[PDB]
Structure formats: structure tokens, C-alpha cells
């Protein structure tokens, strides 16, 4: 906070399958980039990992993230566009939920209709 | 981690950031003086030949 | 700077290993020639000063 | 010290941003200075050549 | 064969010294830059070359780790000894370009 919609500070948000995979990342980082990170983790249902860095060492962090299968992006999501980022994300998540359900209904309807016919 | 580790790693961290800013800032201003001097000479030199 | 620093360490590691290997081959070229047999050129002078004395 | 440490990292970055920004403004100022100090050095050479043309 | 052998023995010996002075120049550089990366400030460091008598390296390496290890990590630290070179794994190679096992303080092992 005080850089939530910031751009002069670089944050790296990212999902990782487990906190175990995250250690291996931490090991690369510490060997190859120094201790320029602050490592925090929150348990999901996945693991929220957070690395926090300069805005000019991004690419080198990115190389580590790609090679151990992490979703650490500079900013997560292509939906960011309201201020906060999250506000846009939350409305786009309401379109996604209702549009999947309609698909499930058309499929279901047709399934009950044609099983016997087939 | 340990309290000792985290403060040692914070004191290292901002020391690099201030240092990166000093080191880049020196190059910019060191080149800005070469640029001043050159550009002042050029502007005269062009024009003094015209007055001539 | 900070960005350049990462790249300075990466190269020191590589270059270090090259030089270390390359010297290993030179020692071998001598060993084979019979110019290094019992002991020679790992304790021998380095511009008129033995190897351990030279490091100090 | 989780959001106390991230909070220091955020300030340090902000501090770096202004330091870099200041040297970029310094240079900007220096480009305007070249012009200024050059504009004066032209009209001093102008007035001498006007004088010795008028002597003739 | 005769002329060549005399120039060739001479050329290697002359090459040997030069590549020796050059190997240590990188290590000195390497160690210095690394120290800056890991500890931060001060940029003024207390630096030594310790001559170990043959086969006491493992015992020496461990003692240094216990004392000084806390500085570079209070959790990033484990006991370790000696130097093993491999292409089985990349771990244990003590390098900043490939992933290795992180040493608790800057220490480089020279084998002659």
C-alpha cells in the first residue's frame, strides 16, 4: 500500500502450486540475484507468493519464474483498467460466471433430448 | 526467518537502491557537462563565421 | 549499478572456470612432455617467487 | 515487519526515482544554459566587427 | 621436431605463469564483487588467504561456516564441507551463474 496503482515501484504478484515449489525459486533467487527480495506467502485453497524488486531487474527475475513454472507476472491479469485494478477484475469475473452457466444449460438440455434419439 | 536476517537484508536493500541512483545520476550529470560545453561552442562557431 | 551487478557476477563465474580449465590442460601438455614428473609447476617460481610465497 | 519491510522497500524505490529524476532535470537545465551563454558570446563578437567596419 | 620441442617447452612454461597471475586476478575480482552483493556495506572488507595443509580442508571449511555463517543468513545456513566437482548435478558448484547450494558466507575453495 501507497503503490497499489504505483508504477515507480515493481511488485511481482504470482501463483505457485505449493509453498514447496516456491522454496526452489527462493534458492535460485538467493544464488543468482542476491537477497533483493522480501519473501511473503499466503495459503490459498495454490500458494500466493510475492517477490518485491526494483523496476530495472525485472527480466532476470522473470527468467527464474519461467524455468520453475510460476505465474509471477509484474501485474497479474489483462484486466486492470479501473482504479483499483481489482474493480475491473470483479465485474469481468461476474460476466465469466453467468456466461459459463448458460453454456452448461444449453448442453444439459440437449443432452437429456438426444441420448434416447442416438 | 529471524529478526536479525530480515533487518540485515533490508539495510543491504535500500543501500543498493540509493547506490544505483547515485551511480546512474553521476553518469547523467557527467555527460550533461560535456554536452553544455560542446553545444555552446557549436552555436557560436557557426555564427561567428557568418558575421565574418 | 544494481542491474549491471547481476551480469558482472554471471560473467566472473564463467571466466573463472575457463581459466581454471585451461591451466589444467597446460599442466597436462607438460606432464606428457616429461617436463613435469615428480613435481614441477605448481610450486615452481612465478617470476622468481614460488607459488605459496607469491599468493602471500 | 512484513508490511513494515515492504513499506521501507517502497520508500527506497521512490527515493531512487527522485534522485534519477533530478539528474535528468539537471541535464535539461544544462541544455538551456548552453544556449544562454552562447547567445551572449555571439553579440559581443557582433559589436566588435560592427565597430571596425564603421572605422573603415 | 627438434626446434619445435625447444620453443614449445619454453612457450608452455611462459604461458603457465601468465595464466596463473590471470586466474587469481579473476578470483580476487570475483570474491570482491560477490562480497558487495551478499553483505552490502561496508565496501571495506577484511580479506585473507589461508593456507590449509593437505587433507584438513573439510575440517577448516566447517569451522568457518559455524562462526561467520550467521552474518549472511540465520536460516539460509547449513553445515557443509570440502569441494566436490560434478556434472551429475549443478548443486555444489558454488557459482552465481548456475544454481548451486548457497554458502552461508563468501568462501571459495582453491585446489592446486
From Swiss-Prot, chain A:
Q: Where in the cell is it found?
A: Vacuole membrane
- Report the PTM annotation: Glycosylated.
Q: Which family does it belong to?
A: Belongs to the V-ATPase 116 kDa subunit family.
**Subunit text:** V-ATPase is a heteromultimeric enzyme composed of a peripheral catalytic V1 complex (components A to H) attached to an integral membrane V0 proton pore complex (components: a, c, c', c'', d, e, f and VOA1).
Further information in the entry reads: Present with 55714 molecules/cell in log phase SD medium.
Relate the protein's function as given in its record. Subunit of the V0 complex of vacuolar(H+)-ATPase (V-ATPase), a multisubunit enzyme composed of a peripheral complex (V1) that hydrolyzes ATP and a membrane integral complex (V0) that translocates protons. V-ATPase is responsible for acidifying and maintaining the pH of intracellular compartments. Is present only in vacuolar V-ATPase complexes; enzymes containing this subunit have a 4-fold higher ratio of proton transport to ATP hydrolysis than complexes containing the Golgi/endosomal isoform and undergo reversible dissociation of V1 and V0 in response to glucose depletion.
Q: Name the chain's protein.
A: V-type proton ATPase subunit a, vacuolar isoform
Species whose genome carries this gene: Saccharomyces cerevisiae (strain ATCC 204508 / S288c) (Baker's yeast)
**Which lineage?**
Eukaryota, Fungi, Dikarya, Ascomycota, Saccharomycotina
UniProt lists the gene as VPH1
**First and last residues shown, out of full length:** 176 to 306 of 840
Curated annotation (Swiss-Prot), chain B:
Disulphide-bridged cysteine pairs: none
| Residue numbers spanned by region Interaction with VMA5 | 1-13
* Coiled-coil regions listed in the entry: 8-38
Which residues does the annotated region (Interaction with VMA10) include? 12-31
Q: Where in the cell is it found?
A: Vacuole membrane
Additional information: Present with 16134 molecules/cell in log phase SD medium.
Q: How does it assemble?
A: Homodimer. V-ATPase is a heteromultimeric enzyme composed of a peripheral catalytic V1 complex (components A to H) attached to an integral membrane V0 proton pore complex (components: a, c, c', c'', d, e, f and VOA1). Interacts with VMA5; the interaction is direct. Interacts with VMA10; the interaction is direct. Interacts with RAV1 and RAV2 components of the RAVE complex, which are essential for the stability and assembly of V-ATPase.
Its annotated function is as follows: Subunit of the V1 complex of vacuolar(H+)-ATPase (V-ATPase), a multisubunit enzyme composed of a peripheral complex (V1) that hydrolyzes ATP and a membrane integral complex (V0) that translocates protons. V-ATPase is responsible for acidifying and maintaining the pH of intracellular compartments.
Which family, according to UniProt? Belongs to the V-ATPase E subunit family.
Protein name as catalogued: V-type proton ATPase subunit E
Q: Which residues of the full protein are shown?
A: 8 to 59 of 233
UniProtKB/Swiss-Prot annotation, chain C:
Q: Where in the cell is it found?
A: Vacuole membrane
Q: Which residues form a coiled coil?
A: none
Q: What does this protein do?
A: Subunit of the V1 complex of vacuolar(H+)-ATPase (V-ATPase), a multisubunit enzyme composed of a peripheral complex (V1) that hydrolyzes ATP and a membrane integral complex (V0) that translocates protons. V-ATPase is responsible for acidifying and maintaining the pH of intracellular compartments. Subunit C is necessary for the assembly of the catalytic sector of the enzyme and is likely to have a specific function in its catalytic activity. Reversibly leaves the enzyme after glucose depletion, causing the catalytic subcomplex V1 to detach from the V0 section.
Under the subunit heading, UniProt states: V-ATPase is a heteromultimeric enzyme composed of a peripheral catalytic V1 complex (components A to H) attached to an integral membrane V0 proton pore complex (components: a, c, c', c'', d, e, f and VOA1). Interacts directly with VMA4.
Kindly give any further remark recorded in the entry.
Present with 21114 molecules/cell in log phase SD medium.
Belongs to which family? Answer: Belongs to the V-ATPase C subunit family.
What is the official name of this protein in its record?
V-type proton ATPase subunit C
- In its UniProt entry, the species of origin is given as Saccharomyces cerevisiae (strain ATCC 204508 / S288c)
Q: What is the lineage of its organism?
A: Eukaryota, Fungi, Dikarya, Ascomycota, Saccharomycotina
- Per the record, the gene is VMA5
> According to the record, which residues of the full protein are present here?
57 to 112 of 392
From Swiss-Prot, chain D:
Localization, per the record, is: Vacuole membrane
- Modified positions (N-acetylserine) in chain numbering: 1
Q: Which domain of life is it from?
A: Eukaryota
Q: What does this protein do?
A: Subunit of the V1 complex of vacuolar(H+)-ATPase (V-ATPase), a multisubunit enzyme composed of a peripheral complex (V1) that hydrolyzes ATP and a membrane integral complex (V0) that translocates protons. V-ATPase is responsible for acidifying and maintaining the pH of intracellular compartments.
Additional remarks:
Present with 2280 molecules/cell in log phase SD medium.
Family according to the record: Belongs to the V-ATPase G subunit family.
Assembly notes: V-ATPase is a heteromultimeric enzyme composed of a peripheral catalytic V1 complex (components A to H) attached to an integral membrane V0 proton pore complex (components: a, c, c', c'', d, e, f and VOA1).
Designated name of the protein: V-type proton ATPase subunit G
Q: Which organism is it from?
A: Saccharomyces cerevisiae (strain ATCC 204508 / S288c) (Baker's yeast)
Taxonomy-wise, where does this protein's organism fall, top ranks first? Eukaryota, Fungi, Dikarya, Ascomycota, Saccharomycotina
* Interval of the full protein contained in this chain: 2 to 57 of 114
Amino acid at each position: 500500500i501507497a503503490a497499489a496503482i504505483g508504477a515507480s515501484v515493481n511488485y511481482v504478484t504470482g501463483v505457485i502450486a505449493r509453498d514447496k515449489v516456491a522454496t526452489l525459486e527462493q534458492i535460485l533467487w538467493r544464488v543468482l540475484r542476491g537477497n533483493l527480495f522480501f519473501k511473503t506467502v499466503e495459503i490459498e485453497q495454490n500458494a500466493f507468493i510475492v517477490f518485491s524488486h526494483g523496476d530495472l531487474i525485472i527480466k532476470r527475475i522473470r527468467k527464474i519464474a519461467e524455468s520453475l513454472d510460476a505465474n509471477l507476472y509484474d501485474v497479474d491479469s489483462s484486466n486492470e483498467g479501473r482504479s483499483q485494478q481489482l474493480a475491473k477484475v470483479n465485474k469481468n469475473l461476474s460476466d465469466l460466471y453467468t456466461v459459463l452457466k448458460t453454456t452448461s444449460t444449453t448442453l444439459e438440455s440437449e443432452l437429456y433430448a438426444i441420448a434416447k434419439e442416438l | 526467518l529471524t529478526p536479525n536476517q530480515v533487518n540485515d537484508e533490508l539495510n543491504k536493500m535500500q543501500a543498493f537502491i540509493r547506490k544505483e541512483a547515485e551511480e546512474k545520476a553521476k553518469e547523467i550529470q557527467l555527460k550533461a557537462d560535456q554536452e553544455y560545453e560542446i553545444e555552446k561552442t557549436n552555436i557560436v562557431r557557426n555564427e561567428t563565421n557568418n558575421i565574418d | 549499478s544494481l542491474d549491471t551487478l547481476i551480469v558482472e557476477s554471471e560473467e566472473l563465474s564463467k571466466v573463472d572456470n575457463q581459466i581454471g580449465a585451461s591451466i589444467g590442460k597446460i599442466i597436462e601438455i607438460l606432464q606428457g612432455l616429461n617436463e613435469t614428473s615428480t613435481n614441477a609447476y605448481r610450486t615452481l617460481p612465478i617470476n622468481n617467487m614460488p607459488v605459496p610465497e607469491y599468493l602471500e | 515487519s512484513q508490511k513494515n519491510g515492504i513499506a521501507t522497500l517502497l520508500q527506497a524505490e521512490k527515493e531512487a526515482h527522485e534522485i534519477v529524476s533530478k539528474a535528468r532535470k539537471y541535464r535539461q537545465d544544462k541544455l538551456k544554459q548552453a544556449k544562454t551563454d552562447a547567445a551572449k558570446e555571439i553579440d559581443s563578437y557582433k559589436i566588435q566587427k560592427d565597430k571596425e567596419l564603421k572605422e573603415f | 621436431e627438434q626446434s619445435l620441442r625447444v620453443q614449445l617447452v619454453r612457450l608452455a612454461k611462459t604461458a603457465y605463469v601468465d595464466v596463473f597471475i590471470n586466474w587469481f586476478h579473476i578470483k580476487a575480482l570475483r570474491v570482491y564483487v560477490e562480497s558487495v552483493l551478499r553483505y552490502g556495506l561496508p565496501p571495506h572488507f577484511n580479506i585473507k588467504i589461508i593456507a590449509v595443509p593437505p587433507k584438513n580442508l573439510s575440517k577448516c571449511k566447517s569451522e568457518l561456516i559455524d562462526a561467520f555463517g550467521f552474518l549472511g543468513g540465520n536460516a539460509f545456513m547449513k553445515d557443509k564441507k570440502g569441494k566436490i566437482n560434478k556434472q551429475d548435478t549443478s548443486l555444489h558448484q558454488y557459482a552465481s551463474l548456475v544454481d548451486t547450494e548457497y554458502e552461508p558466507f563468501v568462501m571459495y575453495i582453491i585446489n592446486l
